[PDB]
């Protein structure tokens, strides 16, 4: 009901709108999120300033597990309400969960494998990711409005 | 833990090191075990890697301990 | 060696109502800049003030509206009430009432005084009644704090619940706008190397310069007492 | 990168390659030929003083310029 | 034959300033003094003397 052809089975597989191109390799991924990078020149080469809000969103299941493990939340619903109110112990649980747990920082044109690096999150205020200065050469990132995507390794093997 | 150079040197490979550390950290986290090294409030990942540093952990040791566990 | 001559404030100069230049005369070599930078930082940081914290205007719901007859948006009236320079005498907060009606400007002279409150600048214009019949009335809420507490961080959740017509202005409790210290050799017959420190502090009228320096030196000696003995 | 710094590099390369092409076409240092390689005519003195090492008089040169203007 | 005189018993002092968060205030401050003396007084003594 248009001027354009209909899409068919061979079309459903082939073409960049096909399955192989951008549904078999390029997929949207959970436990992830992006923000706008800033300098943070005090960090070390192994850490990145993760905003408290992105960190509280990505690490949600880990935090729920912690609150129900330590007894701070009776069931997973109570923990959900705790971290929804953002109470005072969700922050201590964030510090504990994040402690040795890298985050992958990735910038859009991944020309090489240094456009992905694992950093240890350092919780910060605000909503900008703070990226080490000596890492911009690998990332090809200047601090005039570029953005970075953080992904969270989920398994021990990926950690 | 910043650089894993010593853990890599003990095992002499960088993928096998990841695998050995991951299986020992799974023992130490879910299956339940005691760190052979004093954990300074570290996750099982860093504990496993530090253990591999001190020579306390590797694949030979881990399979030997599995044998001993069966003999339990 | 023998010992340090301890500074002491020889005089204060109220060259304006707000601008003042205090002096700390005898300072050993190298303490002009130590004391001066520390004092400027404490003064520019940690000085108590009487910021107006809320306003409740009769007939207004949010800041984004217009009162019939006064030619300022409620946004702009709140922004004019921010810089209102008020010095309370007795309480750590107080509720000024401002009634006014008729064609003309509404300065800070149009607020009724509790007697414990002193508006230092009564010419400071708040709004403009541009109607022969228009009349406005506010319950300004001055209170004493320190630093800068935006309304956002002020409203964590709430005290218990806040009615619909109560606007939270952004509080800046800081009497001082400007510090500028010069250290300069002091003509003393005893020693020549001694210097005097000269602090140009620029309050907004609600802080006496002597009380400002004394409060700074107290805030500093408190931390230095925390440092003196360690401990761990 | 800023997206204008790379543009700067592109413009720099473009102008430099143009400048040096139009420079190499001059061939200032050369040989005294003294007679046209097209018509054998006397290349007048001034043209050999201006361009040391010409091979064509101004007529044959302008002729060749027309053709190489179109192409081939 | 007169020599430079470093009477002060500190051979080097540097201080770094990091971040601290108490429970909610995360804008707090963490002082990290680092000093070596020549031997007349240990570091903690020179610090408290100053
Ligand atoms: C701008 C560019 C750098 C960008 C990164 C650099 C790198 C290589 C450079 C050219 C080459 O040298 C060959 C040639 C040599 C001549 O002698 C002068 C001209 C030429 C065309 C040069 C122009 C320019 O300088 C180039 C493109
Ligand atoms: Mg950019
Ligand atoms: Zn010719």
Swiss-Prot record, chain A:
Protein name: DNA-directed RNA polymerase subunit beta'
Shown segment, full-protein numbering: 319 to 477 of 1407
Family per record: Belongs to the RNA polymerase beta' chain family.
Subunit structure: The RNAP catalytic core consists of 2 alpha, 1 beta, 1 beta' and 1 omega subunit. When a sigma factor is associated with the core the holoenzyme is formed, which can initiate transcription. The rRNA transcription and antitermination complex (rrnTAC) consists of RNAP, NusA, NusB, NusE (rpsJ), NusG, SubB, ribosomal protein S4, DNA and precursor rRNA; S4 is more flexible than other subunits.
Protein's job: DNA-dependent RNA polymerase (RNAP) catalyzes the transcription of DNA into RNA using the four ribonucleoside triphosphates as substrates.
Biotechnology: Co-administration of salinamide and rifampicin or salinamide and myxopyronin suppresses the emergence of resistance to both antibiotics.
Coiled coil: none
Source species, domain of life: Bacteria
PTM entry text: Acetylated on several lysine residues in the presence of glucose.
Binding of Mg(2+), residues: 142, 144, 146
UniProtKB/Swiss-Prot annotation, chain B:
Any one biological process term the GO annotation gives: DNA-templated transcription
Catalytic activity: RNA(n) + a ribonucleoside 5'-triphosphate = RNA(n+1) + diphosphate
Quaternary assembly: The RNAP catalytic core consists of 2 alpha, 1 beta, 1 beta' and 1 omega subunit. When a sigma factor is associated with the core the holoenzyme is formed, which can initiate transcription.
Keywords: DNA-directed RNA polymerase, Nucleotidyltransferase, Transcription, Transferase
Organism: Escherichia coli O157:H7
Disulfide bridges in this chain: none
Free-text function comment from the UniProt entry: Promotes RNA polymerase assembly. Latches the N- and C-terminal regions of the beta' subunit thereby facilitating its interaction with the beta and alpha subunits.
MF GO annotations: DNA binding; DNA-directed RNA polymerase activity
Gene: rpoZ
Listed name of the protein: DNA-directed RNA polymerase subunit omega
Family: Belongs to the RNA polymerase subunit omega family.
First-tier enzyme category under EC: transferase
Signal peptide start-end: none
Enzyme Commission (EC) number: 2.7.7.6
UniProt keyword Cell division, yes or no: no
Superkingdom of source: Bacteria
GO cellular component: DNA-directed RNA polymerase complex
Curated annotation (Swiss-Prot), chain C:
Keyword Transferase part of the UniProt annotation: yes
Region of interest (Required for interaction with Crp at class II promoters), residue spans: 158-161
Post-translational modification (record): (Microbial infection) ADP-ribosylated on both alpha subunits by the phage T4 protein ModA. ADP-ribosylated on only one of the alpha subunits by the phage T4 protein Alt.
Alpha N-terminal domain (alpha-NTD), as annotated region: 1-231
Result of changing residue 41 to C: In rpoA112; temperature-sensitive, blocks RNA polymerase assembly
Transmembrane segments: none
Outcome of substituting residue 161 to K: 5-fold decrease in CRP-class II promoter-dependent transcription
Main EC class the enzyme belongs to: transferase
Gene Ontology MF, one: protein dimerization activity
One GO process term, biological-process aspect: cell motility
Record function comment: DNA-dependent RNA polymerase (RNAP) catalyzes the transcription of DNA into RNA using the four ribonucleoside triphosphates as substrates. This subunit plays an important role in subunit assembly since its dimerization is the first step in the sequential assembly of subunits to form the holoenzyme. Part of the processive rRNA transcription and antitermination complex (rrnTAC). The complex forms an RNA-chaperone ring around the RNA exit tunnel of RNAP. It supports rapid transcription and antitermination of rRNA operons, cotranscriptional rRNA folding, and annealing of distal rRNA regions to allow correct ribosome biogenesis.
Record remark: domains: The N-terminal domain is essential for RNAP assembly and basal transcription, whereas the C-terminal domain is involved in interaction with transcriptional regulators (such as CRP) and with upstream promoter elements.
From Swiss-Prot, chain D:
Zinc finger (dksA C4-type) residue numbers: 36-60
Keywords: Metal-binding, Plasmid, Zinc, Zinc-finger
GO molecular function: zinc ion binding
Domain of life: Bacteria
Membrane-traversing stretches: none
Protein's UniProt name: Protein TraR
